[PDB]
Each structure stands twice: as structure tokens, then as C-alpha cells.
Nucleic acid binder design. Structure first.
Ligand SMILES: [Mg+2]
Ligand SMILES: [Mg+2]
Length: 132
RNA sequence: UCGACA
DNA sequence: ATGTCG
């Protein structure tokens, strides 16, 4: 009951808050389909969220109906809500991540999608394929 | 008072 | 250690 015909996304960091990156992979093959350049300060949950939204945009642009897997219950909720409820402080070091979060929410509020966003069941299936 | 996902 | 929700 793993839907192999899917995109898996995940965050990586150094610190939390700290340097954040994320990527998207083909769940079947492991092939890296997109990878974001490291953002100097952000949170895990912000990155998990940006990964999902990147994935929605990636699949939409390519007319793909594949679902997206994420391991992040937080991010899955933020995407469903179109709203990332982060605590991270706003200052000049966090301005970049907060601009990207704001632009992701804005994309969600201006586009449609029917991509199923699914929880990757780590406890049964091991680490998601996009794990760092 | 936790439980869970990262 | 921290970020987040049920
Ligand atoms: Mg994750
Ligand atoms: Mg991971």
C-alpha cells in the first residue's frame, strides 16, 4: 500500500533553527527531481512545508497527477490550511525563509490542484525516500 | 499532564 | 537540544 507512482519530499537541516534545504525524489527510483539551495536560517517545519508546495508546483507545471508523500504531520496541515503557523522570529537573518513561506502561501491561494498529499508511514516503511 | 510527527 | 500538532 505504498503508492510507488508518487513524488516524495523532505527537509534537511544543520541546526533547527538553522540552515535549511529540501528536495523531491521519485518514490520508485530515488531519482532527485528538484533540490533547493540551502536557506541560511529556517525551521524544520518551514522547510517541510516549502518542500510540499514546491512539489505541488513541480507536478502542476508537468501536468502530473502523482500524489506527494511527506513525513511531516505539521507541514501537511499547513498546506491543507494554506497557512504556515511558524514561531520563528522575523529579523533580517530570517527574512529570506519568511519571504519564501509567504510566496508559497500565496501560490496556494492562487492555484488549484488535486494532488493527494499523503503521510509517509515511517514506522512501517522506513525513512522516506527523500530523507537526507 | 502528556501523546505524536519531524 | 528545537519545531510543531492532537
Ligand atoms: Mg521529514
Ligand atoms: Mg527526514
Amino acid at each position: 500500500e505504498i503508492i510507488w507512482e508518487s513524488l516524495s519530499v523532505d527537509v534537511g537541516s544543520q541546526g533547527n533553527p538553522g540552515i535549511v534545504e529540501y528536495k523531491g525524489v521519485d518514490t520508485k527510483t530515488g531519482e532527485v527531481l528538484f533540490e533547493r539551495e540551502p536557506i541560511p536560517i529556517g525551521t524544520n517545519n518551514m522547510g517541510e512545508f516549502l518542500a510540499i508546495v514546491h512539489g505541488l508546483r513541480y507536478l502542476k507545471e508537468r501536468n502530473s497527477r502523482k500524489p506527494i508523500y511527506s513525513n511531516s504531520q505539521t507541514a501537511i496541515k499547513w498546506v491543507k490550511d494554506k497557512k504556515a503557523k511558524s514561531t520563528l522570529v522575523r529579523n533580517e537573518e530570517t527574512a529570506l525563509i519568511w519571504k519564501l513561506v509567504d510566496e508559497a502561501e500565496e501560490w496556494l491561494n492562487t492555484h488549484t490542484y488535486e494532488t493527494p498529499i499523503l503521510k509517509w508511514q515511517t514506522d512501517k516503511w522506513g525513512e522516506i525516500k527523500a530523507d537526507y
